[PDB]
Amino acid sequence: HHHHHHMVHITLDRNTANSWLIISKDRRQVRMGDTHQNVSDNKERFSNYPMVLGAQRFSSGKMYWEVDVTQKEAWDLGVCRDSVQRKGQFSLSPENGFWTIWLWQDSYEAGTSPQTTLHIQVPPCQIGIFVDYEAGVVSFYNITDHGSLIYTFSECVFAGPLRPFFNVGFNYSGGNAAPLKLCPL
C-alpha cells in the first residue's frame, strides 16, 4: 500500500471512554485500569466494554492512521458511525455501524456478521487503518509485515460521520494490561 501520505493525527476523546480506561496526557495511549477511574457517567461513554473513540470526525476524503498492539492478547480496531449505541450489549457489525477487526484467543477475525476468519502469517505489532469515505472502503494493513493487506470492507454504508474506534479488551487473564498506542507519522 502507498496510503501513508493521507496520514491524520488521531487523538482519543476522554468523554467517550469506558470509565475504567486511562488515557495518557498526550491523548495518544489508552489502557485498562484495575478499577473505576473516578469520572462522572455521561451519555457518550461505552458502558459494557473497554471502548473509546477518537476525537476526529470524518465525512469525506481519505484518512490513514497506525496503532501499536504489542503484547496484547485481545483488542478491536477500526472505525464506527458517530451514532453507534453506547449503552448495553451489542455486536460489532456493519449493520450496527462498525467496520473493525479483532484478536481474541489467538485468532484474528473481521467484524462481519457472522465474523470472518483472517489469515495472517506474521502476527502484527502495528496495524494501519485506511478509510476512503467516497469509495466506501475500510482497509487494514500489517505494518510488521511490510504493509501486507489484512482485510478490506467494501461497499460500506457509513450513513454519517465516522470516528476512529478502539477496544483495549478485558484483562481477566492478567496478560492483556498493555496499552493501545497511536504511532507517530
Ligand X SMILES: Cc1cc(N2CCCCC2)nc(CO)n1
Applying the rule CB under 6 A, the residues between 95 and 154 that interact with ligand X are 104-105, 107
Nearer CB in complex with ligand X: 70/107? 107
Distance CA 108, CA 101 (A): 7
CB 172 to ligand X: min, Å: 10
Decide whether 20 or 104 has the Cβ nearer to ligand X: 104
Total interface residues for ligand X by CB under 6 A = 3
Q: Least separation, in Å, of the C-beta of 107 and ligand X?
A: 5
60 binds ligand X (CB under 6 A): no
Q: Which is nearer to ligand X, 40 or 105 (CB)?
A: 105
* Shortest Å distance, C-beta 105 to ligand X: 5
Residue 21 CB, shortest distance to ligand X, in Å, is 21
**Of residues 117 and 121, the one with the C-beta less far from ligand X:** 117
Nearer to ligand X, 10 or 103 (CB): 103
Cβ 69 vs Cβ 140: under 8 Å: no
d(Cα 97, Cα 135) in Å, to the nearest integer? 17
Q: Using CB under 6 A, list all residues that contact ligand X.
A: 104-105, 107
